[PDB]
Design a protein around this ligand. Structure first.
Ligand SMILES: [Mg+2]
Length: 354
């Protein structure tokens, strides 16, 4: 397919939004902006500190771009958590996003990882040094079980990045590779457990639902992301590996077949998500429904995924899908589309220079 599956894409997206029950929220734009700025402001000051500035080797521009995409992701999806929680999660997920930027071999700095860890010595790898120092600010919002999940997933993520450094799409015939890697760097368990602050949820009382939420949320979150990202990544000769591209290489199937597989998982995942949590604790179903919706809004509104382009193409096309799509889009935009100038300021560099 030298061309983007525009039709096919539009279809599944609508089906997906329908399945999850994509609709309006009592989360106003004035509320969204309130939070966006709160989160961004705390994070910005954090990354602007000299220590963070030294140890984190990231280009100023990308750091700004990353922080902004992450604050957005967090505020729009963790709708029911506190302002401080959105902020702290924003800092954590910004660190993770930034690590996918390093080309640097982890190996030499990981040689004494466990011995330093057990001894309480600052880690050799600067990233760990920063993240582990910051971690308590995130972990304070959760109980021990949810905390353990955040810790593991982040550790899993670190290995994932390491593996990704080899741009390996898996050996042909290695069917278990693709999902193995995707889970490794999807932060699924991190996301899943960070949805339940101990301030508004009892980890022990809701242990079974939380666990189930983590288990199911992990795959939904990553597959929805892989799907929504399929468009930007299509003509990106720079991005060589991805769940879909890897299915292709490892499963030895066509890109169509691979994209096919993703869609079946995504939709089935959606259907089962609702099936399971509808009749459960209302507060749980609420956090979950909001995350799914917010997560979708975010993808549709953040420039990174460039979905606006797909809009301004089928904008006046008159097929069923086409319209149901554009309708959903505009819905998002209403509370989603927000000029950065309304919340993301001043730039991190400016704060860093002061
Ligand atoms: Mg990729």
């Amino acid at each position: 397919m030298e061309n983007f599956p525009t039709e096919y894409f539009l279809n599944t997206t609508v089906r997906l939004l329908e399945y999850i029950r994509y609709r309006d929220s009592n989360y106003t734009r004035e509320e969204r902006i309130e939070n966006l700025h709160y989160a961004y402001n705390k994070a910005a000051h954090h990354f602007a500190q000299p220590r963070q500035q030294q140890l984190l080797k990231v280009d100023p521009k990308r750091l700004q771009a990353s922080l902004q995409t992450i604050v957005g992701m967090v505020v729009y999806s963790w709708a029911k958590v506190s302002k401080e929680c959105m902020a702290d999660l924003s800092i954590h997920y910004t660190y993770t996003l930034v690590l996918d930027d390093s080309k640097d071999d982890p190996y030499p700095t990981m040689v004494n990882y466990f011995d330093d860890l057990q001894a309480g010595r600052e880690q050799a790898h600067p990233w760990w040094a920063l993240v582990n120092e910051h971690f308590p600010n995130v972990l304070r919002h959760f109980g021990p079980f949810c905390s353990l999940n955040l810790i593991r997933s982040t550790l899993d993520f670190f290995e994932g990045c390491w593996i990704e450094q080899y741009n390996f799409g898996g050996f042909p015939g290695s069917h278990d590779y693709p999902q193995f890697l995707r889970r490794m760097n999807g932060l699924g368990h991190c996301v899943g457990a960070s949805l339940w602050p101990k301030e508004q949820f009892n980890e022990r009382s809701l242990f079974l639902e939380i666990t189930s939420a983590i288990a199911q949320m992990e795959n939904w979150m990553v597959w929805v992301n892989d799907l929504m990202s399929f468009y930007k990544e299509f003509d990106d000769e720079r991005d060589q590996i991805s769940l879909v591209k890897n299915y292709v290489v490892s499963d030895e199937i066509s890109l169509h077949e691979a994209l096919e597989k993703l869609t079946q998982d995504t939709l089935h995942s959606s259907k089962q998500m609702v099936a399971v949590f509808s009749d459960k604790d209302p507060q749980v179903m609420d956090t979950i429904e909001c995350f799914m919706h917010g997560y979708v809004t975010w993808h549709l509104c953040d420039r990174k995924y460039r979905l606006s382009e797909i809009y301004e193409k089928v904008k006046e096309e008159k097929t069923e899908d086409a319209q149901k799509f554009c309708k959903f889009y505009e819905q998002a935009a209403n509370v989603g589309a927000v000029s950065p100038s309304e919340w993301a300021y001043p730039p991190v560099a400016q704060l860093a220079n002061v």
